[PDB]
Design an enzyme around this catalytic site. Structure first.
Site, short mmCIF file in Angstrom:
data_model
loop_
_atom_site.label_atom_id
_atom_site.label_comp_id
_atom_site.label_asym_id
_atom_site.label_seq_id
_atom_site.Cartn_x
_atom_site.Cartn_y
_atom_site.Cartn_z
N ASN B 44 0.83 -1.19 0.00
CA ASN B 44 0.00 0.00 0.00
C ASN B 44 0.86 1.23 0.00
O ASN B 44 0.73 2.08 -0.87
CB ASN B 44 -0.93 0.03 1.20
CG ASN B 44 -1.96 -1.08 1.17
OD1 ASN B 44 -2.20 -1.70 0.13
ND2 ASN B 44 -2.59 -1.34 2.31
N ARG B 374 -11.85 -3.45 -15.77
CA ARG B 374 -10.76 -4.19 -15.16
C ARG B 374 -11.24 -5.58 -14.70
O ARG B 374 -11.22 -5.89 -13.50
CB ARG B 374 -10.18 -3.40 -13.97
CG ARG B 374 -9.50 -2.07 -14.32
CD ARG B 374 -8.64 -1.51 -13.17
NE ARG B 374 -9.42 -0.89 -12.09
CZ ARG B 374 -8.90 -0.42 -10.96
NH1 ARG B 374 -7.59 -0.49 -10.74
NH2 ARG B 374 -9.68 0.13 -10.05
N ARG B 404 -7.13 2.34 -13.73
CA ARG B 404 -6.10 2.88 -12.84
C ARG B 404 -4.76 2.17 -12.99
O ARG B 404 -3.71 2.82 -13.06
CB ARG B 404 -6.55 2.84 -11.38
CG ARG B 404 -7.51 3.97 -11.01
CD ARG B 404 -7.47 4.29 -9.52
NE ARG B 404 -8.28 5.47 -9.19
CZ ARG B 404 -8.36 6.01 -7.97
NH1 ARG B 404 -7.68 5.49 -6.96
NH2 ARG B 404 -9.13 7.07 -7.77
N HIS B 434 -16.17 2.84 -14.08
CA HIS B 434 -16.09 2.07 -12.84
C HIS B 434 -17.40 1.35 -12.49
O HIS B 434 -17.58 0.89 -11.36
CB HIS B 434 -15.66 2.98 -11.67
CG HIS B 434 -15.33 2.22 -10.42
ND1 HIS B 434 -16.09 2.31 -9.27
CD2 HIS B 434 -14.36 1.31 -10.16
CE1 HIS B 434 -15.61 1.48 -8.36
NE2 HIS B 434 -14.56 0.86 -8.87
N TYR B 467 -12.83 -9.04 -2.69
CA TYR B 467 -13.74 -7.91 -2.55
C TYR B 467 -15.15 -8.33 -2.18
O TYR B 467 -15.56 -9.47 -2.41
CB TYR B 467 -13.80 -7.11 -3.85
CG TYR B 467 -12.50 -6.44 -4.21
CD1 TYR B 467 -11.32 -7.18 -4.32
CD2 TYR B 467 -12.44 -5.05 -4.41
CE1 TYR B 467 -10.10 -6.56 -4.62
CE2 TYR B 467 -11.23 -4.41 -4.70
CZ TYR B 467 -10.06 -5.17 -4.81
OH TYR B 467 -8.85 -4.55 -5.07
N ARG B 563 -13.89 2.93 5.01
CA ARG B 563 -12.72 2.12 5.33
C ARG B 563 -11.42 2.83 5.00
O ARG B 563 -10.40 2.55 5.60
CB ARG B 563 -12.74 0.74 4.62
CG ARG B 563 -12.57 0.76 3.09
CD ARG B 563 -11.43 -0.18 2.61
NE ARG B 563 -10.24 0.58 2.18
CZ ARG B 563 -10.10 1.20 0.99
NH1 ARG B 563 -11.07 1.15 0.07
NH2 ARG B 563 -8.98 1.90 0.74
N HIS B 591 -15.86 -3.03 -1.74
CA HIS B 591 -15.84 -2.50 -3.10
C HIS B 591 -17.29 -2.09 -3.44
O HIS B 591 -17.62 -1.73 -4.57
CB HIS B 591 -15.35 -3.59 -4.05
CG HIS B 591 -14.73 -3.08 -5.32
ND1 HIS B 591 -14.39 -3.92 -6.37
CD2 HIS B 591 -14.34 -1.83 -5.69
CE1 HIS B 591 -13.82 -3.20 -7.33
NE2 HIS B 591 -13.78 -1.93 -6.94
#
EC number: 2.7.4.1
Lengths: 687, 687
Positions: B44, B374, B404, B434, B467, B563, B591
């Site tokens: 991250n 994606r 992304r 998205h 997710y 989150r 998600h």
């Protein structure tokens, strides 16, 4: 035509694949290995029709057009007569083997023979694993199977019946994504090993595949398969006044590559018809009924659900201890010291691969030249040449862009290299470099020293293991310069070139061979010791064969070991009375052709990559090497001895194509391919 | 600047990744799971510098050039001060965990701690498995690491010492080809589980890697790693008079993407220098010393050499029994009957995938429209769209060409389709869709009936499992038409378009959201029951935040579950006195963002894919759906209840970024992500 002076290569080939079938029958081979052979046999005949047979057609046609002069349709007949006779023989074996498999508790059963329990098991299995891969292709008036339909795949033609209504749909047997043999849960005795064909699982689930969206009284499935003939091109290099006079009606009837359509015998004629159309089955195209299953080739992967006994035991590839001697700092010292000869698959390809990895970062390595023919998928050699590039090394890489079947697999093997600093060099239109060399130069204190690799077969790390090939590693300038020349010849063939040690196709070959045979003939006509001993995959070239007939008639002894085609007829009163020839078809595939001439008393021993076939002497790039080192010359001679001493797999070559097995007289029981291992194994015992 | 009205998102993010670290510490998680978290934490922070931080730099720079007006360098400081403080905290944990691992008989040891036996074991292992992947890259005056050097990989800089001589060479840690953790043979007690880092095996074999061709008194290795900042582009859509006046000295100093060079602390300055050059480390480029190891991200795959206990137990994905009811012939009947809401990963993505496979051959299916953002590598959905094509179906497929990070993975996902009969449609320059929809139309006796899919997250069959996302399946025309419109909007956005049920970014969103909040505010200023309940990944957008502050001050109750980032400060006397917000960081990744408004008494419940962040409201294609079916509206409401009822992973969001854990009062001990499972599980019990 009267008294066959030679044997038609196409017939010789049928006999060859028959020898392969003998492996399926030969009880001395483990059960599963014999099953798999059936696959080999099938895959061969498959390529027979796709290529060699399609080739013969054309020749017979090219003959026609304006002047056909060979008893062609008399041969065609003989051809399919041997094939039909074989097919019925194939059928016998498969049955016999099926029985035998059952004796070992294995049962290849069909959808109709399932238990009222496995049925419920399959359905579940299907919905949970197969379904996702099985999607009906609906056959509508606008659907054009023509395109998207997969070549050589098996399809299930489904008949959807509703009243006097009939809808048609296709189901692709996904042999690529899912295993073609699934193991069913043992009914009663836990001993049994029951398995079913993926084709028959579908056949059994037709209802679960279509009931969701279709209404019908019944569903029927029939298998079919479609195949296209291979690509043509190398036949116009003779059509001087032919191709020129040749009418457009023949160029079109010769270029156009036909299509073979095979369907299960009981497919309703209406459906056959539906497909005849959807599949543009025109004139030159072939339509043939027969059988519930196609692609027997898939038996080359028949799983083994029995004990190891049913499968061949894998021999570990051996390290050539010489490369390990502590007195050698590295690979270049081992080779500089002595010419190194490796024999695959008894040895690991791992040495050549270690060497190449060294040359990629060894400060003393100046340059590296090497060719990429039909190597293994995504070469580890390519990565090495990249490093060498990144580390300096003038890296030169030749990539032929059209092999026999591994062609388009070298059209990508390039854009990559250039970017990193590699000089890439492509071969002409359709030219084949069936040799596999690499030259390495390295500054060894002041002087430049070249180390070459001459490999009879290709760099395929897959080829080393099913094939038996040689790999010579040397620093001997006599051979070194010659390889250097070869690479130059490749880059600039427009420039005149000569070789004093290598046999290079198609520069000398013919000359270099005729000349060697002509010398034995000479020594024989002088009562001196003469001899011609060849180990080839195919002995066909007209000229070379007659050259041999001559050697025989001049008193020269000739021993042939051809595993494939052999248009030469041995033992012909006054023609070939001194020519003994056999064929050994065993586990491994001979990729190594040897040449051995008595040459007085000082024997000349060549390691080649070319068969005595016209295309290998005059149209492709081939390389044969003499063994200047008497030590290595000897080793090859022993191996050739073990081979001709075989009495387990050796078969006779006769003008009767009988494929009889060489009988073991009071001589020892030998199985070359196994004895060869013990021979090598003994060479790698601690010095 | 005086009394922070909001929280800098970059600081909020640091706090977020810290919550992630709390997972590594949290003893309630299995040992190996905690190790792997450390990897998550690292990966991250890695992306933090590559993207978000690089982004902040630019903004602060864009500010400068002609008019910088934010206490930017005061934030930069705070940023790295939180980071350094964290790094030292990370170090604590890793140590603690290393100890703990040993207690469990696992030992991550280094090359210096090997036994006088494992040493001989490694060397052998190395020569037989690693060597082939490890080839020295020699650093010469002409070598230009600049290019071929891999981005983000770890390299070992080898120092070859011979007298007052020093040669330099690089060794790439091949983390891609070989596992980064190798298990060594147990020294004495068979209990121990000793393992070493691949980095340290090399470190230990340096001699065997170079002695073959190099002469030296000693060899030293030091690790280093190089990283480039992500790609820029979306910042000029505001530089009206800016980008215009903006000087070339700034466009060059803003476009040019810097390079970060990290090296082991004790690397001789001469070598650091050698690399500073070879790596074009210019002005804007960063050079930083530190540590023997980099890429802690690789800990996300730390193997588990202990008993299952040390790893999380995988929950089986559940079938939504509704799709199986025998009264349904197929998927379309199940959905026509009732709106279907699936929640991943508790449910299998397998349903949507079954449905799509049906639409590809169901005679009644007329057309299919769907977007490819994606999705998972080599989609099984693509194959389906191809069949539909082959079976008629007017197949329309939208492929955005720049996500992304999964961008260039949709530039190939096309040439294929077109060929088979698929209408492909590409998104504008850099536009992100998205949302993940698909519309299916099918002639259901006379009439055409559309079935849509609205998925909060993407079609990634990999995304469904790490997710938690929603998937609404419906035949409700109110929603059906709206999706149809969406696809039209995509194909022709130049045409005016309006939505009456869907929230579509960036068509309405802002308006549609402001308006809903403004209504609660209204009902609150009338003493009626009002409420705003959001479940987002990030709550940052200025406007949206103030809109909430307003709701709170007007008496409206607001419950946030964010989150990630949260620029909104909850509990600000007179500003946000009625806003309670928490964050749950557990196994799975949220998600799914929900929106819930009291709306009098008739609650409106939206399932969205967009966070309350500017880029999600005004610059990308987002979709939020209202739940017209009260049954499904209820289920979401329960789930949201379990969530806000968590007392194991829930943490408080405060203006102190304390990340304190929500204390379990006399209330029950709940772990949402687990309770959610039992909730779903109970819904799939036989009716």
């Amino acid at each position: 035509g009267q008294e066959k002076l030679y044997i038609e290569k196409e017939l010789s080939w049928l006999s060859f694949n028959e020898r392969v079938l003998q492996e399926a029958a030969d009880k001395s081979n483990p059960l599963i290995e014999r099953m798999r052979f059936l696959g080999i046999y099938s895959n061969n005949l498959d390529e027979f029709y796709k290529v060699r047979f399609a080739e013969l057609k054309r020749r017979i046609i090219i003959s026609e057009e304006q002047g056909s002069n060979s008893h062609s349709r008399h041969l065609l007949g003989k051809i399919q007569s041997r094939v039909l006779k074989a097919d019925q023989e194939f059928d016998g074996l498969y049955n016999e083997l099926l029985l035998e498999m059952a004796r070992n508790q294995i049962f290849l059963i069909n959808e109709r023979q399932l238990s009222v329990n496995q049925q419920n098991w399959l359905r579940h299995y299907f919905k949970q694993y197969l379904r996702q891969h099985i999607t009906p292709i609906l056959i509508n008036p606008d659907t054009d199977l023509v395109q998207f339909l997969k070549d050589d795949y098996t399809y299930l033609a489904v008949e959807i019946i509703r009243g006097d209504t009939i809808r048609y749909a296709l189901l692709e047997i996904p042999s690529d994504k899912v295993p073609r043999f699934v193991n069913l849960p043992p009914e009663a005795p836990r001993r049994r090993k029951p398995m079913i064909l993926l084709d028959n699982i579908l056949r059994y689930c037709l209802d679960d595949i279509f009931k969701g969206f279709f209404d019908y009284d019944a569903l029927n499935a029939y298998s079919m398969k479609m195949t296209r003939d291979a690509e043509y091109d190398l036949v116009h290099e003779m059509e001087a006044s032919l191709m020129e006079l040749m009418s457009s009606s023949l160029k079109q009837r010769l270029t156009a590559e036909p299509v073979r359509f095979v369907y299960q015998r009981d497919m309703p004629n209406a459906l056959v018809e539906v497909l005849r159309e959807k599949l543009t089955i025109s004139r030159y195209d072939s339509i043939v009924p027969g059988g519930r299953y196609h692609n027997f080739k898939d038996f080359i992967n028949f799983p083994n659900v029995g004990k190891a006994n049913l499968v061949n035991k894998p021999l570990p590839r051996l390290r050539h201890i010489w490369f390990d001697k502590a007195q050698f700092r590295n690979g270049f010292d081992a080779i500089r010291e002595r010419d190194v000869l490796l024999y695959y698959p008894y040895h690991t390809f791992e040495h050549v691969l270690e060497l190449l990895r060294q040359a990629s970062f060894d400060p003393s390595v100046l340059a590296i030249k090497i060719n990429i023919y039909r190597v293994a998928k995504d070469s580890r050699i390519i990565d090495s040449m990249i490093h060498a590039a990144h580390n300096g090394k003038k890296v030169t890489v030749v990539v032929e862009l059209q092999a026999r079947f591994d062609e388009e697999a070298n059209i990508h093997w390039a854009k990559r290299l250039t970017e990193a600093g590699v000089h890439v060099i492509f071969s002409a239109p359709g030219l084949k470099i069936h040799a596999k060399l690499f030259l390495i130069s390295r500054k060894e204190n002041g002087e430049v020293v070249r180390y070459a690799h001459i490999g009879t077969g290709n760099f395929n790390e897959k080829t080393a293991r099913l094939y038996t090939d040689y790999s010579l590693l040397t620093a001997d300038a006599r051979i070194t310069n010659e390889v250097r020349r070869v690479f130059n010849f490749i880059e600039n063939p427009y420039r005149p070139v000569t070789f004093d040690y290598l046999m290079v196709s198609p520069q000398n070959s013919r000359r270099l061979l005729y000349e060697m045979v002509d010398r034995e003939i000479a020594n024989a006509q002088q009562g001196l010791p003469s001899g011609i001993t060849l180990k080839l995959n195919n002995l066909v070239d007209k000229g070379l064969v007659d050259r041999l007939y001559a050697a025989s008639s001049s008193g020269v002894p000739v021993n042939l070991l051809v595993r494939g085609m052999c248009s030469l007829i041995p033992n012909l009163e006054g023609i070939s009375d001194n020519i003994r020839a056999i064929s050994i078809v065993d586990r491994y595939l001979e990729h190594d052709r040897v040449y051995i001439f008595e040459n007085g008393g000082d024997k000349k021993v060549y390691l080649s990559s070319a068969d005595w076939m016209t295309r290998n002497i005059d149209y492709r790039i081939e390389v044969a090497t003499p063994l200047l080192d008497p030590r290595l010359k000897q080793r090859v001679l022993d191996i050739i001895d073990i081979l001709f001493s075989d009495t387990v797999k050796a078969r006779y070559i006769d003008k009767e194509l009988s494929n009889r097995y060489v009988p073991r007289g009071n001589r020892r029981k030998v199985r070359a391919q196994l004895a060869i291992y013990d021979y090598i194994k003994s060479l790698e015992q601690p010095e």
